[PDB]
Design a binder for this molecule. Structure first.
Ligand code: K
Ligand code: K
Ligand code: K
Ligand code: K
Ligand code: K
Lengths: 259, 244
């Protein structure tokens, strides 16, 4: 009842190469209609100048929308009024699909992206499910093996005791690693509050993906490869969680089956 | 897999949506009307001033409006976000669909939602099973009444006619969407991606407010079916191929 080591490594790459494949289908499929609401506002701000519309409620009523729908499109900080969606964005995006988060912070506009998507999902999501298995297992165990050195020493002092300790320790060594480090990190890179980053993390991992926050979707960001990294994280932490989530489902079932 | 014990969760879980929606509407509604009130003013303060030919005030006019927008303001023109929308919202949470088309702003209600998930979503997985079974058991009393892999092709295409392609045709006549959009919507919905680009019950222009918890209750049976099918496939495609 186990998956083979070098088996998943072939799978995983089979997936990256599926994702990288998806990012390409999208890259040169949505590149053109990319809104880029930052340069579209200037054409709306200045257009209000060369025309100097004045003393009208009707001409204002719509502005609010023209600034709302424009703002909503990830518009500039509206105080500047003075390039994005490449692979790191397209790849990351594709990933938010199979992972089923779907941040959708950047809507799809090209009808092909919708049809292709429909298929990229129905074919992507399932493919992922396995990756988690390969990871949750081949990885999840590695760490259980690591802690071995800890419990090997605890035994030199006294069994049934070390059992519970490793169980609680592992959750933490896993938590502190997939909750805390990431939450703390998202603050020092996206200038969010502690809460927001933990709020984010939680929505990321629960894969609710509200979309209100997304680790790498600011056109003003500088580090390009950073997005896929946070993705390589989502994978890891998403997989770990699943393992710990099922085990408890049993520990909670073995005690619930006697009803 | 108790068929009368899960019926209780349909009341518990269903309450978890209402019993939870109450907080969201009581945590966000205040700052839902404030961004409106604070817009009304900023809107006419400028309008009634009838300024002219300037930029000094437009840089502000813009930033003045965004503030109101960030807190969730009206689109234009010059009512939204109550329990009805919260219920739906709360539900998009457990379904982990999270359309987010409508966001959380209250820094306080945000944390409330952080926990509502951890402990709220785990129950849904149970109901989709409790329902993924009753719909999985309905394969006999349904298909039996009318060689081997031949009776599988049918069940697959049974649900596509019931859950997949049924609502899509319905959504074009309810929200004017194209053929595709409905499909694209349903898939992103069912696969629970929840892109949020599109959404069934949130359009501002609706006149039937009763049919929404029905479109939502549909999501239940929807994912439940999609679960019932993955439940068999996931346990069949594995055993046959072990040594393969
Ligand atoms: K989602
Ligand atoms: K959005
Ligand atoms: K989502
Ligand atoms: K979303
Ligand atoms: K999801």
């Amino acid at each position: 009842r186990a998956m083979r080591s070098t088996t998943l490594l072939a799978l995983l790459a089979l997936v990256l190469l599926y994702l990288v494949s998806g990012a390409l289908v999208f890259r040169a499929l949505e590149q053109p209609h990319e809104q880029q609401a930052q340069r579209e506002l200037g054409e709306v701000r200045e257009k209000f100048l060369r025309a100097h519309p004045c003393v009208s409620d009707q001409e204002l009523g719509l502005l609010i929308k023209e600034v709302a729908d424009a703002l909503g499109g990830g518009a500039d900080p509206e105080t500047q009024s003075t390039s994005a969606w490449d692979l790191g964005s397209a790849f990351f995006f594709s990933g938010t699909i199979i992972t089923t988060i779907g941040y959708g912070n950047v809507a799809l506009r090209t009808d092909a992206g919708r049809l292709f998507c429909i298929f990229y999902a129905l074919v992507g999501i399932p493919l992922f499910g396995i990756l988690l298995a390969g990871v949750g297992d081949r990885l999840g165990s590695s760490l259980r093996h690591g802690i071995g050195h800890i419990e090997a020493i605890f035994l030199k002092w006294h069994p049934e005791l070390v059992r519970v300790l490793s169980a609680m320790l592992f959750l933490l060594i896993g938590c502190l690693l997939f909750v805390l480090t990431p939450t703390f990190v998202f603050c020092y890179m996206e200038d969010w509050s502690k809460l927001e980053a933990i709020y984010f993390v939680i929505v990321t991992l629960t894969t609710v993906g509200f979309g209100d926050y997304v680790a790498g979707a600011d056109p003003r960001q500088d580090s390009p490869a950073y997005q896929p990294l946070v993705w390589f994280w989502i994978l890891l932490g998403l997989a770990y969680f699943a393992s710990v989530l099922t085990t408890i489902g049993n520990w909670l079932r073995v005690v619930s089956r006697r009803t």
